Write an enzyme that holds these catalytic residues in place. Structure first.
Site, PDB file in Angstrom:
ATOM      1  N   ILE A  15       0.834  -1.180   0.000  1.00 54.62           N
ATOM      2  CA  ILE A  15       0.000   0.000   0.000  1.00 54.62           C
ATOM      3  C   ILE A  15       0.887   1.255   0.000  1.00 54.62           C
ATOM      4  O   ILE A  15       1.976   1.274   0.583  1.00 54.62           O
ATOM      5  CB  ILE A  15      -0.914  -0.060   1.226  1.00 54.62           C
ATOM      6  CG1 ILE A  15      -0.110  -0.084   2.522  1.00 54.62           C
ATOM      7  CG2 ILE A  15      -1.812  -1.263   1.152  1.00 54.62           C
ATOM      8  CD1 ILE A  15      -0.911   0.344   3.725  1.00 54.62           C
ATOM      9  N   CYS A  16       0.403   2.308  -0.658  1.00 57.55           N
ATOM     10  CA  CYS A  16       1.008   3.642  -0.560  1.00 57.55           C
ATOM     11  C   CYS A  16       0.712   4.243   0.833  1.00 57.55           C
ATOM     12  O   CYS A  16      -0.436   4.550   1.137  1.00 57.55           O
ATOM     13  CB  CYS A  16       0.484   4.528  -1.692  1.00 57.55           C
ATOM     14  SG  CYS A  16       1.337   6.121  -1.880  1.00 57.55           S
TER      15      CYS A  16
END
Lengths: 377, 74, 151
Positions: free
Chosen positions: C85-86
């Site tokens: 995930i960012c």
């Protein structure tokens, strides 16, 4: 008959409509330059025209800038002109009065343009005890506190050693109070450490309260945001409001800013009302309201209540800096109209969507032709 | 020692630096030269993005090098 | 070690006052590792699913950001092929005033508010932006396919 609202009107219409085109770079230069930076994304086997096609299609060279500073820069070179703005560069920014005074008072009833810059306080939150024997300012981590056996320094962003006014007797105490090995290299303002637990923790607490104190007299400031505001000549104290122009990194473009009419929505705050909010940004010490206001002013249209929450809570304190100057409607509307000539001349079309779709295509073609060149071996 | 930075517009701008200049420094160099904050810029070199804790020699770039300044990200 | 108090107390606060729709436990061995199950948020294409994640505290934790990985397969444009995930902060980096609970909450929110204009998986982001309704349809299918019957 050349207004202040005629420059707002014309630059807003033109950004909204032509996007990246207001800069007036030819599509052939966009294409070549993008080809250059993207040469390496092309697959090396199969038919190259198709492989190139694939890269050229995924490109977004024509999408407008995103850097808040490059946006405000190009507003400047329109409203003021190349040599115009080049010598507005010079003007040093004046940091905003606690309450908003200097700005209000720096706003005659001419056709002026404030450029703002905004700084965040990038103070150290890491410290490391270390022997002096092994220090080396060009070897160690910058923007950090170092605690030597007999001295307490800050290594700064450029790698200068800055002494923190502590006797060597206090330093000696602190160094030797801090024994548990995972707090040898750790963080200053931990909230889970208790002075009334250990001597170690009393030390770590104390060193931290030193550093915090010293640090409120050190230029830790780094620049975070950039925008412009436009204050057209009125004939009243009410028939006068302001028009802020920004972009934001990985968020929105000036084009986007105008298309959701945020500029207008912030002009419906009032001038004192804006500056009062903007002034509070730099003076509140409550993160939750620093976040709220930051969102209100700087988020893209609509994401005002979710722009500065959770992970993007604003924890650095901020410093708003402004500089003003005036705009001759006549030189600005010549700057703009000279851009509209370029567009209509080189990217002719009768919808504007069409003029852009031509731009993009001409970009894509240029890019395709450079890549075709580069990758023929 | 002295490097170049090319933008997508082809606006090349030249800076005087030091091998042991951090990448967070070059961005402020650029800030002083272009009025763009460092938080609103991204520098890449020969494909690779550059991170803020590293130096030009740690990326192995000196004298007449070009860094691409990138002013659009998602 | 296993200290400081910070990690200890964060781990207690997570077990004591947990985040609704989120279960987050330390691993027996390794107190810096965390098994996490986040429920598919109501009013989202993942409603009625459960998703397994691992959250690691890097050894500089308090000032490095924790690393997060989705274990469960999920059709979301902000989670790459490997379940990454960012966690990126906007014109800032990770402060130590950001704790584990903020990142857990943030993943949760991301499930409710999928952002295809910041893609991490281009095929699915690209389909999310044009045929949103077909995206969401496949999202619900995948949560049925991989995120139901997981405990």
């Amino acid at each position: 008959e050349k207004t202040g609202l005629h420059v707002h009107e014309k630059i807003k219409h033109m950004v909204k409509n032509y996007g990246t085109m207001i800069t007036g770079i030819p599509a052939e230069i966009l294409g070549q330059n993008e080809a250059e930076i993207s040469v390496g994304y092309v697959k090396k086997m199969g038919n190259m025209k198709e492989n190139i096609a694939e890269v050229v299609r995924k490109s977004e060279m024509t999408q407008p800038t995103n850097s808040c500073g490059k946006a405000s820069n190009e507003v400047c070179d329109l409203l003021l002109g190349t040599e115009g703005a080049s010598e507005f560069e010079k003007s040093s920014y004046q940091v905003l009065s606690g309450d908003g005074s200097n700005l209000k008072g720096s706003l005659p009833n001419k056709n002026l343009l404030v450029r703002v810059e905004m700084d965040r306080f990038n103070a150290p939150q890491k410290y490391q005890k270390i022997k002096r024997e092994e220090f080396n300012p060009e070897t160690a981590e910058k923007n950090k506190i170092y605690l030597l056996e007999d001295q307490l320094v800050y290594l700064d962003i450029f790698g200068k050693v800055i002494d923190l006014g502590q006797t060597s007797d206090t330093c000696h105490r602190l160094f030797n109070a801090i024994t548990t090995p995972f707090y040898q290299n750790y963080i200053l303002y931990d909230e889970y450490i208790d002075p009334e637990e250990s001597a170690e923790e009393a030390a770590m607490f104390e060193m931290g309260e030193i550093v915090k104190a010293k640090m409120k007299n050190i230029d830790c400031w780094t620049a975070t945001h950039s925008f412009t505001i436009f204050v057209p000549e009125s004939d009243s104290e009410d028939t006068r409001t302001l028009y802020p122009y920004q972009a934001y990194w990985t968020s929105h473009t000036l084009q986007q800013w105008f298309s959701g009419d945020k500029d207008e929505k912030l002009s419906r705050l009032g001038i004192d009302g804006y500056i009062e909010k903007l002034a509070l940004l730099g003076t509140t010490t409550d993160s939750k309201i620093r976040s709220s206001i930051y969102g209100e002013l700087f988020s893209p249209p609509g994401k005002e209540h979710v722009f500065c929450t959770g992970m993007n809570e604003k924890f650095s304190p901020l410093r708003v800096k402004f500089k003003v100057t005036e705009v001759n409607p006549e030189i600005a509307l010549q700057n703009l109209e000279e851009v509209q000539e370029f567009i209509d001349t080189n990217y002719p079309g009768e919808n504007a969507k069409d003029q852009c779709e031509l731009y993009k295509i001409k970009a894509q073609e240029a890019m395709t032709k450079q890549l075709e060149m580069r990758l023929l071996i | 020692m002295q490097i170049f930075v090319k933008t997508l517009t082809g606006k090349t701008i030249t800076l005087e630096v030091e091998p042991s200049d951090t990448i967070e420094n070059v961005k402020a160099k650029i800030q002083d030269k272009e009025g763009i904050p460092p938080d609103q810029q991204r520098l890449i070199f020969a494909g690779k993005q550059l991170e803020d804790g590293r130096t030009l020699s740690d990326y192995n770039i000196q004298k007449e090098s070009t860094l691409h300044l990138v002013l659009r990200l998602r | 070690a296993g200290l400081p108090r910070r990690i200890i107390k964060e781990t207690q606060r997570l077990l004591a006052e947990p985040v609704p729709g989120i279960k987050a436990e330390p691993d027996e061995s390794n107190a810096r590792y965390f098994h996490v199950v986040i429920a598919g948020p109501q009013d989202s294409p993942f409603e009625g699913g459960t998703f397994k994640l691992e959250l690691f505290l890097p050894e500089e934790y308090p000032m490095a950001a924790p690393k997060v990985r989705f274990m469960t397969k999920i059709y979301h444009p902000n989670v790459d092929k490997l379940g990454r995930i960012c966690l990126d902060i906007l014109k800032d980096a990770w402060s130590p005033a950001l704790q584990i609970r903020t990142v857990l909450l943030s993943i949760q929110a991301l499930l409710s508010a999928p952002n295809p204009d910041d893609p991490l998986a281009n095929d699915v982001a690209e389909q999310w932006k044009t045929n949103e309704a077909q995206a969401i349809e496949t999202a619900r299918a995948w949560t049925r396919l991989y995120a139901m019957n997981n405990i």
